[PDB]
């Protein structure tokens, strides 16, 4: 049993109690039932199930199938995501079609969320355009690889838009290479068709001209249905002859999974058949903690410096919580606050506002509300750079601290001072703010390794709709396919980008590492966050400058402080890798050169980018000057 | 541990035997016996590597004679380190010289691709050497093949050629291989790498940390071991020794310097531990068979010596082949002595044909290394004689994709008429396929970075871009050109939509009559199933002489072989078909001033009548285009 690999795929009749929330012991029981992987609905089942045909008044459920309750690697292992049935893209009613259009995405990117290997989507028309361009620019926009599972339909006759009246030439084959079109020819080693096999055999899937085809085409998985009956000896559930010599035909290689499609409303032998269906079906063809705990004693020393006036209750709010290890680590900051200073007093009692703007993040944060937190925190839905209406709206109180963790390697990378900046108008002239400070460093290096490394980064066919971190985005070309463009060029393209490195075939050209950017919160002046600044070294030898190696530490609050900083490099700490901020051609350098990095952080209605370049002089004062990488962040732009 | 540290040998003329150049395999078997594994050796050969020049244009250098044969390429490729000929100065003062000397740099590049060398080592004799830097450039840029390069170093700046202690103002080991690094266009350190020379004196460089450190931001491959010490090592030697060596893949050559040889042979050993403390047979077959066979034919009449020409030796097999078919012919029927004319272009090959020649075909064959298109006219001057056969091999998976025909015509110059042509003729076929696997797969070809100046199968020839950087342009579109070229595969996931193959090109030598070589055949299939046409698989037949003959067509497959696998005439995108389509594959074999394309396309008319054309593909050999 071990090279066959029998999913079982959720029904509408294995749906028990809270299914959604406890799929590890699902899961569990189903592989008791000596079965491995599993195709469970992504949305979750009080979702997947529900049925659509309601007023104006029924919506559809909220994603609810929390990750949390599984580790990562196992959800990649077993569990294969499949979209809501209700979902109709090629609807024939407009605003259906739309609004399945807007599900069909959302249940997309949760997928992406969750972090699946395999996703499988069923096809139930003959003809699903709009299904199809969706599919298509996703796939061809994402960057990642991940394999997709095309279900067919068990014949013909079962698609909504059949008209026994025109279906000249079609069949299901056609139907699968008409998708396979209309989503552009995704390679088939990660877009790939399954076949849903019944009772009753189709023609083309007997006839052996026809079967054949299958063969020439990106097979990943059949898909049975309970549709069998229990011939031969103690009523041995089993399968008819050209349901075996087709799946013997077309079982090829033993990464051809197989999934079982309960149908019938068998409670089955109580339970136990499932594994009966398993054999037939075989034998027919054979967590970086450090920076958190900062984060905690950073806390703590905050409640200290309020809770000494003798404080009651006091307003936190987090922003941007994530799946929220800072939730839990702040609550527990609390407590050990009130174990250590109230003693034999009146304990002092944290009230804590999350604030997030990723669905799928507070998919999690409310799973994690209810059995972690026991209903303690308030979930905000909104980027906090809209707090400020929302909250006096909602009738919520200013808060005292605001914590957030938006740090990049080179600190202001990713946007933080902006994000803490939206969300200035809502707080007391009391409130501190951790992080108080962070400061953006800086230090020449050279490597050939690392430069040549970035200079030759190339696009794939396969990998040619991904989009820029410029300021452009994918388009459709003439073919009707989607490409993202690159006219500075590919290789300018690759120089003008900051870069997260593990620096290892490099060299230092300075014993010392340079303040570049600071930044405090809260910003109650509102002080500009774009800046401008020069940065200059001396060389002591003759070499080649690839460029800076970027870093930055900061203070949570006070004392309290982590950094990446090599002078200063909290022990031990793995959530940060240096930046690099890389010249387009190694500079060549000698004993006594100056260096100045002539570093910009501009800021746009939409976006943030640095345009970074280099002036070099020589003893001699006479100068020189590298061209200005990244003029308009056209190929690194942050946006917002 | 041990075996963890590769120790090489490079040779020098402190070790030059004699008739080394033919025996290699003892060489390094005594290598061996000393204890290190890898080799360095000089890849024309001694007698080429250590000539010296210094005469007028009387001193021409010493032929490249370092045969494959006398090991198995695998051999060769695991254990020979090759190395550019040390008196090869690209960057002469003399303008003559340097020349020269680009030249034979070529010729010996070229052998090291010809060995099939996995590591070749390069030595700079200069401060700067941009002559060179610009061969080797073009030369690694424009390789398809995947192979690493070691850039040798001098001792120290100061024994470089161009030398001179006035202008050498911040000059170092380092300073140089940057330099040059530089200018061959800083090619990925993954296959460019650099190798420093450890002298007897210790340079300043190598000892002051600051600038010691600077090589591991090089790519580091070998250190450079010569002879100056007694069997020890110096505190700094030891020292540096160490602080540069930070992977394991690391190679350490030991360098032949003082010792006009080591006292104790043992000694040759103590060095390298101190250092550690730190194919198809039945194509061949059946060309024999054919070749009896005519020997019968043309030997039956009384004769007792027939004179057959070879075109194309390759490294002669058919050859060795002609002469055991005589050998045995003379016993069976009969006598009938055979003289073998053996012409090829190959100059790498030649070397294996005088090898041959010599160690298998006791020099009973004239080799003759010239292209066999101008034989005709050096048939004369060198006192030869018109053919009675005429043996070759220049086809390909598609038959006459390689233009046996037209070198074929070239050497209708001068035969008899009684010149029975082996093979006399051959048949293009092709099949109609169905598959998503093959079409995906040759639509999502693409070019990295490191692979951006290797030249295009059609008339487009790599060029220098506004950075001075070797590039291949596909002004076509890349899926253009990745879709209008035939291709050989092993058909993996696919689907036959045809029950037998059908006829395309014939050709009949000799082409006697001189019949034009451009061809247009257009071929008609019919479709019996919902699919997706994806293209044609081509095939071939050819005829050697009457009866026997040999075959890659699906049904009239010669068994057992590997010889050919099939092509592929794809098509830009897949065509739906379904029951009762008619296909006219279109095909125009054309023909140019300086080679041969394929204008290729398929139309498609439907039960009802329906006439619709896929585009033209390949027009005027863009994507494809064997040069003559």
């Not at 069923?122 to 061809?140: G, Y």
């Not at 989503?183 to 790939?192: M, R, T």
């Not at 299958?214 to 041995?236: D, H, T, Y």
């Not at 004062?621 to 990244?630: D, K, L, M, W, Y």
Request: net charge neutral; with cysteine; charged share 25%.
């Amino acid at each position: 049993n071990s090279r066959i690999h029998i999913g079982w795929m959720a029904t509408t009749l294995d749906v028990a109690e809270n299914l959604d929330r406890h799929v590890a012991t699902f899961c569990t029981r189903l592989g008791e039932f000596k079965y491995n992987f599993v195709v469970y609905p992504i949305g979750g089942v009080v979702r997947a199930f529900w049925t659509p045909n309601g007023s104006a008044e029924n919506h559809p459920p909220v994603i609810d199938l929390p990750d949390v309750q599984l580790r990562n690697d196992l959800w990649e292992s077993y569990v294969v995501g499949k979209i809501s049935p209700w979902i109709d893209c090629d609807s024939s009613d407009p605003a259906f079609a739309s609004l399945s259009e807007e599900h069909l995405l959302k249940e997309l990117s949760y997928i992406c969320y969750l972090g699946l290997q395999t996703m499988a989507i069923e096809l139930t028309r003959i003809s699903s355009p709009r299904t199809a361009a969706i599919l298509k620019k996703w796939i061809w926009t994402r960057n990642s690889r991940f394999t997709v599972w095309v279900q067919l339909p068990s014949a013909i006759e079962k698609c909504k838009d059949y008209d026994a009246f025109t279906i000249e030439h079609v069949d299901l084959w056609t139907i699968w290479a008409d998708f396979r079109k209309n989503c552009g020819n995704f390679s088939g080693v990660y877009f790939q068709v399954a076949l849903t096999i019944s009772s009753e055999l189709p023609d083309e899937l007997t006839e052996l001209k026809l079967v054949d085809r299958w063969k020439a085409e990106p097979l990943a998985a059949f898909v049975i249905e309970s549709g069998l009956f229990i011939s031969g000896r103690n009523g041995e559930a089993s399968i008819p002859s050209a349901h075996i010599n087709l799946l013997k035909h077309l079982w090829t290689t033993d990464a051809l999974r197989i999934v079982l499609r309960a149908t019938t409303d068998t409670f089955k032998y109580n339970t136990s058949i499932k594994s009966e269906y398993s054999q037939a079906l075989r034998h027919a063809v054979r967590q970086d903690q450090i920076k958190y705990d900062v984060y905690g004693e950073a806390v703590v020393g905050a409640l200290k410096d309020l809770g000494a006036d003798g404080r009651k209750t006091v307003v936190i709010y987090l922003l941007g919580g994530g799946r929220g290890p800072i939730g839990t680590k702040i609550l527990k900051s609390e407590r050990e606050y009130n174990n250590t200073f109230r003693q034999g007093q009146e304990s002092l009692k944290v009230k804590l506002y999350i604030v997030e703007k990723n669905p799928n993040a507070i998919v999690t944060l409310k799973y994690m509300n209810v059995r972690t937190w026991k209903r303690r925190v308030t979930i905000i839905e909104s980027d906090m750079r809209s707090l400020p209406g929302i909250a006096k709206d909602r009738g919520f109180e200013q808060p005292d601290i605001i914590v957030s963790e938006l740090l990049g390697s080179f600190g202001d990378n990713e946007l933080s001072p902006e994000c803490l900046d939206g969300v200035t108008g809502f707080l007391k002239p009391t409130t501190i703010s951790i992080p108080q400070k962070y400061t953006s460093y800086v230090k020449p290096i050279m490597s050939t390794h690392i430069h040549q490394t970035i200079k030759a980064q190339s696009i794939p066919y396969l990998s040619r709709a991904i989009p820029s971190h410029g300021r452009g985005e994918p388009e459709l070309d003439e073919d009707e396919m989607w490409i993202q463009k690159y006219p500075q060029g590919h290789v300018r393209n690759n120089m003008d980008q900051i870069y997260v490195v593990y620096l290892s075939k490099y060299i230092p050209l300075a014993e010392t590492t340079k303040p570049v950017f600071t930044f405090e919160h809260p910003n109650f002046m509102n002080s500009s966050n774009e800046r401008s600044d020069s940065i200059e070294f001396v060389m002591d030898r003759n070499a080649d400058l690839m460029g800076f190696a970027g870093y930055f530490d900061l203070q949570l609050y006070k004392t309290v402080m982590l950094s990446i900083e090599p002078s200063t490099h909290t022990p031990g700490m793995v959530s940060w890798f240096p930046a690099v901020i890389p010249l387009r051609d190694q500079l060549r350098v000698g004993e006594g050169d100056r260096i100045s990095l002539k570093i910009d952080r501009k800021v746009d209605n939409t976006g943030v980018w640095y345009e970074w370049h280099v002036e070099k002089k020589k003893t001699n004062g006479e100068s020189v000057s590298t061209p200005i990488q990244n003029p308009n962040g056209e190929s690194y732009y942050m946006r917002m």
